[PDB]
Design a protein around this ligand. Structure first.
Ligand SMILES: Cc1cc(C)nc(Sc2c(F)c(F)c(S(N)(=O)=O)c(F)c2F)n1
Ligand code: NA
Ligand SMILES: [Zn+2]
Length: 257
């Protein structure tokens, strides 16, 4: 099965998932000089006031925090988006070293980690139908740099020891994802894909320009997770990022400056 190692990592995925070599793959390098300012884009509307977190899960490839998306609670709209996208979950990708870990890059700069807030287009009724559609998902991407602690991240960090291994979950209620947002909602946007198998080309990417700051100690706790299941040889969950893929004809649009 797929993973991040030499044997089953990103350069192998195309054999099971040929769309890996498709025309709208993610992530990409954001060339800030060739991104076009688009004065017709709207400010992002992030309405997370009624978000209902439920659970945190080690999937074997990352960890994710899941939300109750059975009603229009937390939603993303505006920006490049037509209609309303409902928050389903967030997760992170990160490095073995502070110098790497993000999936998107900015002028080839890698960040220590990248947060993905995943939302589905409510015109498609649920997530499983939305992922079959070319405008099914909107993923809000936020870079993490190592510096000051992010207080809003600590509740996540502190629960990771209870989900060390693949398939472990824990109750994770009353978590407010607004605590993970930077001050500015200036962004880049482009059409792309899931960054893990099945690599479906169903994502409108919205990548915030301003990274959030996390402490070295917070990210080191991400690196103590395990890709393996309990009772199996320990493989640290690090470097679970896909590298930049070819932009091909696509244009990246900037909301700013
Ligand atoms: C592959 C898969 C299967 C299922 C059932 N949910 C998901 S949710 C999800 C996910 F885990 C991800 F890593 C991504 S990502 N990196 O943001 O493209 C995603 F969009 C998602 F929508 N992903
Ligand atoms: Na409900
Ligand atoms: Zn992701």
């Amino acid at each position: 099965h797929w993973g991040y190692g030499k044997h089953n990592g990103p350069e192998h995925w195309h054999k099971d998932f040929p769309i890996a070599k498709g025309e709208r793959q993610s992530p990409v390098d954001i060339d800030t000089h060739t991104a076009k300012y688009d004065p017709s884009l709207k400010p992002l509307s992030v309405s997370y006031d009624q978000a209902t977190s439920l659970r945190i899960l080690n999937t074997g490839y990352l960890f994710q925090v899941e939300f109750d998306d059975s009603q229009d609670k937390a939603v993303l709209k505006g920006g490049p988006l037509d209609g309303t996208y409902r928050l389903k979950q967030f997760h992170f990708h990160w490095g073995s070293l502070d110098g790497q870990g993000s999936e998107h890059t900015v002028d080839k700069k890698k960040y220590a980690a990248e947060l993905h807030l995943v939302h589905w287009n409510t015109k498609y009724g649920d997530y499983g139908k939305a992922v079959q559609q070319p405008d099914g998902l909107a993923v809000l991407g936020i870079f993490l740099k190592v510096g000051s602690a992010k207080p809003g991240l600590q509740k996540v960090v502190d629960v990771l020891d209870s989900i060390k291994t693949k398939g472990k979950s824990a109750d994770f209620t009353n978590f407010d994802p607004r605590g993970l947002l930077p001050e500015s909602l200036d962004y880049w946007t482009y059409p792309g894909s899931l960054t893990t198998p099945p690599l479906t080309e169903c994502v409108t990417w919205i990548v915030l320009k301003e990274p959030i700051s996390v402490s070295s100690e917070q990210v080191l706790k991400f690196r103590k997770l395990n890709f393996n299941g309990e009772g199996e040889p320990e493989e640290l969950m690090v470097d679970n990022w896909r590298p930049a893929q070819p932009l091909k004809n696509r244009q990246i649009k900037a909301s700013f400056k």
